[PDB]
């Protein structure tokens, strides 16, 4: 991605301050809460009936950190999200049947979680760079769909 270096530097720096555990559970929980139809893939997590039920859910929370974990590595390969997510791309496609529109929804949730977290520091320009990242990630993850 057409991340500019001041852009790439901007991403990297905030990212470094991220508690993946927490940001990953928060991101996945908020997705399930704001866009309830995304719950369709997580029936097995249990109870998602309420925002508290969702936010509290340990596996939502454990799947949130694993998803952010994977995201976090892609940030090492910004250069190449595509080859960095190819296998995850096929997986999401061939085994999980996840519509890639979900990746977009998670991306935007993530940006809201980061602003929430970093307030002040998650400036328009830093948001612009992350927007480009989350869009890049969604595209690399959707790339192997067929």
């Amino acid at each position: 991605v057409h991340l500019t270096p001041e852009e790439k530097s901007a991403v990297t720096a905030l990212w470094g301050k991220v508690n993946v555990d927490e940001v990953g559970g928060e991101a996945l929980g908020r997705l399930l809460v704001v866009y309830p139809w995304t719950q369709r893939f997580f029936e097995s997590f249990g109870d998602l009936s309420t925002p508290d039920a969702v936010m509290g859910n340990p596996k939502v929370k454990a799947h949130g950190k694993k998803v952010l974990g994977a995201f976090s590595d892609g940030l090492a390969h910004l250069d190449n999200l595509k080859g960095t997510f190819a296998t995850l791309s096929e997986l999401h496609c061939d085994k999980l049947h996840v519509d890639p529109e979900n990746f977009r929804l998670l991306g935007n949730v993530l940006v809201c979680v980061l602003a929430h977290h970093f307030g002040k520091e998650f400036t328009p320009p830093v948001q612009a760079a992350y927007q480009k990242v989350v869009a890049g990630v969604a595209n690399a993850l959707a790339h192997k769909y067929h």
Partner: protein, 141 residues
Amino acid sequence: VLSPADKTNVKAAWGKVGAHAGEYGAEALERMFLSFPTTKTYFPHFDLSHGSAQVKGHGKKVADALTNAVAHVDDMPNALSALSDLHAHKLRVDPVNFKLLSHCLLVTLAAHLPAEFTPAVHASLDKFLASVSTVLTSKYR
């Protein structure tokens, strides 16, 4: 909102569709699967091969539902509430997908009703499908 003209346009084009509705439904779905392959993530359980009976069977179902919305053009929220419930709560199809099928249905009709598919009818039809899609996703959250 559907104007009187829109409604006239839609009853007219749908009238001509007539007996072919199912076959157009099944073609609209194939078009969709082929042009927007991500829509296939919702039919992992279907035989999505050309001439798949699951597809032919699903096309009629979709075509019947649209025929029913046309039949109740003045009460679609209610005519389709069961299908809104279905899609809101069980299927949980992401909303963007409705635009993709709408578009493939418009293409299908264009491909089959050249004399009817005038600019004004095309305008009415798009507004209709957008209305049906809005109805189907109205209970999502």
